[PDB]
Design a protein around this ligand. Structure first.
Ligand SMILES: [Cl-]
Ligand SMILES: [Zn+2]
Ligand SMILES: [Zn+2]
Ligand SMILES: [Zn+2]
Length: 116
DNA sequence: TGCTTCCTGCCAATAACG
DNA sequence: CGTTATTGGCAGGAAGCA
């Protein structure tokens, strides 16, 4: 499934197939589905299948049109981080990865996923 | 060259377990 | 039914793309 590389006490897990390296073994296993397709994640709204559960989730939010990311400076909402970020940078000349929280991520309500 | 999707360290929520 | 194992959400940078 994988092998290990250790440099300066640091442990990395190497994918047998593509030789990508991971700090986290769980990352390796998650990534490896791409090669093996042991598990499948079918979009419940269309024919598409995904090698990662989170890819399907992001895809399914596109079908529902829920806009979970809201700019706190003007109230506009966006379907993902990327649209929200580029809005805030270009319209508000600010960075949401900065020290201030410039946005809110709402709970997913248009489908059923894990709640924080 | 701006959408669009992908990626992975981290770890909370969920599941399996015994 | 607590304890241990797994799943997958998330940020935000990278990669892909027409
Ligand atoms: Cl919404
Ligand atoms: Zn690989
Ligand atoms: Zn779909
Ligand atoms: Zn705004």
């Amino acid at each position: 499934d994988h092998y290990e590389l250790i440099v300066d006490g640091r442990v990395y897990y190497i994918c047998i197939v593509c030789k990508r390296s991971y700090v986290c073994l769980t990352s390796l296993r998650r990534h490896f589905n791409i090669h093996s397709w042991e598990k499948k994640y079918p979009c419940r709204y269309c024919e598409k299948v995904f090698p990662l559960a989170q890819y399907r989730t992001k895809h399914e939010i596109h079908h529902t049109g829920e806009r979970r990311y809201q700019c706190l400076a003007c109230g506009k909402s966006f379907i993902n981080y990327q649209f929200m970020s580029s809005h805030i940078k270009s319209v508000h000349s600010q960075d949401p990865s900065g020290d201030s929280k410039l946005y809110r991520l709402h709970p997913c309500r248009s489908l059923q996923i894990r709640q924080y």
